[PDB]
């Protein structure tokens, strides 16, 4: 269930509400400023890191479950979504239908959105690929 | 005592000419006169012999900067007022008050700035991200100091000579204790 959730359901949740559009009306008293703006932020592919921890000073290192139990940390991994930004402009002629065009401000760009706690021995976990001697090295019971 | 006396590099003073001045005419008729009312609400002039600079306002208030000595600033204000007399205004010389005397010197040894900031923390503010010099604010006299790793000292905010000199004489023992290599 956890591998299904990480591999497929996270991307589905991202894609269900990926597009976020805010239409800024012209609000023009005079016809000099008859331009309307439409700003679109869209989420793309979601990426999951290996489990990790950031300390107080900002140094981030790979976290293994033995260390997370001893230091009372959370065995989690970061989520990074691709965000593309769209800016659209249209000449606000009353009666005429608005036709938006890109101003070529299509800046895009992984952005950190949170830390998903990782189930142990799942595909994202370090212990899934570990052999018995590797588990003994990490002070994990096989 | 200290073997070196600070040397002045800028004296900022003011003069009240006591008359309303039309900045339009003084820009056109004086030689080195710059008037940009959009940029600044005064006319900037500078003359060669004292290497000073006068900011002249419409109200007749005057600012003289760039002088090395008080007599040099007095002579500069005298000649700028003479220019205003020759340009066709009744600018009577009324008062001359020197506000700022900034002078620089060199103690000729490297200084440990972090230790000085830690020790005299109530008067000092060291932020090498913004400015590479320490800002020491003496309470008596009210002289601010820019302290550097090369030993160069900038004393700023003096009204006459007997503040900057005693400020350097008081700041020398607390910098002699901090030496690098």
């Amino acid at each position: 269930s956890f591998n299904q959730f990480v591999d497929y359901t996270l991307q589905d949740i991202i894609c269900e509400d990926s597009t976020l559009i805010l239409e800024q009306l012209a609000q023009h008293t005079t016809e000099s400023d008859n331009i309307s703006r439409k700003y679109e932020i869209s989420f793309g592919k979601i990426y999951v890191t290996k489990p990790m921890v950031n300390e107080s000073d900002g140094v981030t290192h790979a976290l293994y479950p033995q260390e997370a139990r001893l230091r009372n940390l959370t065995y989690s991994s970061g989520l990074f979504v691709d965000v593309k930004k769209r800016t659209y402009e249209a000449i606000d002629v009353p009666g005429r239908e608005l036709k938006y065009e890109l101003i070529a401000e299509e800046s895009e760009g992984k952005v950190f959105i949170g830390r998903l706690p990782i189930m142990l021995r799942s595909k994202n976990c370090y212990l899934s690929e570990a052999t018995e001697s590797d588990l003994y090295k990490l002070k994990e019971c096989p | 005592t200290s073997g070196i006396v600070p040397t002045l590099q800028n004296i900022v003073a003011t003069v009240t000419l006591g008359c309303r001045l039309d900045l339009k005419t003084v820009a056109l008729h004086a030689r080195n006169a710059e008037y940009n009312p959009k940029r600044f609400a005064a006319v900037i002039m500078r003359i060669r012999e004292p290497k000073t600079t006068a900011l002249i306002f419409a109200s007749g208030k005057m600012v003289v900067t760039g002088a090395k000595s008080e007599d040099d600033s007095k002579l500069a204000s005298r000649k700028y007022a003479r220019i205003i007399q020759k340009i066709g205004f009744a600018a009577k010389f009324t008062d001359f008050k020197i506000q700022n005397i900034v002078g620089s010197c060199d103690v000729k040894f490297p200084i440990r700035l972090e230790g000085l900031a830690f020790s005299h923390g109530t008067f000092s503010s060291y932020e090498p991200e913004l400015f590479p010099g320490l800002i020491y604010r003496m309470v008596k006299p009210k002289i601010v100091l820019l302290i550097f790793v090369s030993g160069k000292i900038v004393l700023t905010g003096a009204k006459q000579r007997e503040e900057i000199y005693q400020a350097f004489e008081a700041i020398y023992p607390v910098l002699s204790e901090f030496r690098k290599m």
Binding site: T74, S76, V111, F112, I113, G114, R115, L116 | -
Partner: protein
């Protein structure tokens, strides 16, 4: 507009951490429990 201020990652992080630390599943209790380590079969 600052993207670092736009996306508050603490929302996702604290929501998952709170709903897994406590049994509460929302904003259902007892969903998350401390794992029993008395015996292996336990």
């Amino acid at each position: 507009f600052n993207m670092k201020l736009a996306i508050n990652a603490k929302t996702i992080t604290s929501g998952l951490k709170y709903a897994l630390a406590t049994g509460n599943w929302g904003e259902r209790a007892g969903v998350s429990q401390v794992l029993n380590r008395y015996t292996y079969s336990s």
